[PDB]
Amino acid sequence: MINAQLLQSMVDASNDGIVVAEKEGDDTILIYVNAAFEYLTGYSRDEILYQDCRFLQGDDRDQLGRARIRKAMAEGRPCREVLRNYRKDGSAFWNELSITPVKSDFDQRTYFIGIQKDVSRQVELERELAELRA
Amino acid sequence: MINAQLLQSMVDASNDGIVVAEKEGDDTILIYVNAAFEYLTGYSRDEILYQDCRFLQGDDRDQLGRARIRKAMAEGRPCREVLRNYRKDGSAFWNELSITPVKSDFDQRTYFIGIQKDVSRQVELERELAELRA
Ligand SMILES: Cc1cc2nc3c(=O)[nH]c(=O)nc-3n(C[C@H](O)[C@H](O)[C@H](O)COP(=O)(O)O)c2cc1C
Ligand SMILES: Cc1cc2nc3c(=O)[nH]c(=O)nc-3n(C[C@H](O)[C@H](O)[C@H](O)COP(=O)(O)O)c2cc1C
Numbered sequence A, B: 001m002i003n004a005q006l007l008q009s010m011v012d013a014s015n016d017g018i019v020v021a022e023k024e025g026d027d028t029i030l031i032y033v034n035a036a037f038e039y040l041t042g043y044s045r046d047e048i049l050y051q052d053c054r055f056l057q058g059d060d061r062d063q064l065g066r067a068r069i070r071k072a073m074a075e076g077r078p079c080r081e082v083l084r085n086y087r088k089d090g091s092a093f094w095n096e097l098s099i100t101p102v103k104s105d106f107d108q109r110t111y112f113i114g115i116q117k118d119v120s121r122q123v124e125l126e127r128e129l130a131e132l133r134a
Helices: A004-012 A035-041 A064-075 A120-132 B004-012 B035-041 B064-075 B120-132
Strands: A017-024 A027-033 A079-086 A092-103 A110-118 B017-024 B027-033 B079-086 B092-103 B110-118
Touching: A004 B004, A004 B017, A004 B092, A004 B110, A017 A035, A017 B004, A035 A110, A064 A079, A064 A092, A092 A120, A092 B004, A110 B004, A120 B120, B017 B035, B035 B110, B064 B079, B064 B092, B092 B120
Parallel strands: none
Antiparallel strands: A017 A027, A017 A110, A079 A092, A092 A110, B017 B027, B017 B110, B079 B092, B092 B110
16 A cells, blocks of 8 residues: 555654554563654653553552453453553543554564543543433 | 554554545545554445545535534644544444644655544433533
8 A cells, every 4th residue: 555664654643642562471562652642641752662551550550441451452352441541740631542452473472553542521521421310 | 663564564453443645735535544444434445545535424514524624634733523424334423533634844745644433422422411411
């Protein structure tokens, strides 16, 4: 279709937070993040890169999304889950995570492309509708 | 960060619908679409590719999203808009469109990366909350 350099620059430049990570045992290590992801998190490419993405959950580690994500990556099937995340400045938001497993098949490595959005307003709208139905 | 071939395969394989298009006057022509986009629309890469993406609106051409998208692409700034779209089988859904303008700067061409999601359930939840507030 298009040359891969063009595509990489279209991704580098996307308004959508986009990352790639590589499975290592019980971890997945971020090898690629775009600018919009740096803007979403309030971190820098260097701060972010080369660790597992969970670091954004911070203290708040009892969240059902985790298990559903973990369950889903394990089975090798895409998921979409929203977790509470925290920026560098400490502020808190609902991050929707779209995670897709990709096995290399050239080798035994598996990768994941994430695509993430601050969903905080969409959630507030639901908490409200939930209480109206009560 | 990562080699561009790896990245292109992570995109090719994403569960998220991702396209790229190229500005030509009042049009933008799709030069790249991934599999998930083919699945979103119910079209095939060959059917989809090489025309302007509006073809999915079909008959339903009076939609405010259009003007906001048009206004936004013009100004050269990202937007996120949801339009009513129609698959090949005719079925209808709410498609959220995240569109990012990218100028090449090597030449005078401008491109757009879109990232699109069936948002129909999130919308139904709002129509409901809207009427509760009435
Ligand atoms: C592609 C990809 C994107 C991810 N996005 C980040 C995210 O933006 N925020 C977050 O808190 N965790 C995110 N994670 C989730 C964690 O890295 C981790 O897989 C999850 O918390 C489940 O594993 P655990 O229970 O061992 O923590 C992402 C993971 C992957 C593979
Ligand atoms: C990157 C990109 C992705 C787009 N996504 C498609 C979409 O999935 N659905 C749709 O109906 N139109 C989509 N469009 C919107 C139309 O192609 C068009 O630009 C919009 O309807 C406004 O222009 P117009 O008023 O001249 O029709 C997309 C456009 C771009 C540039």
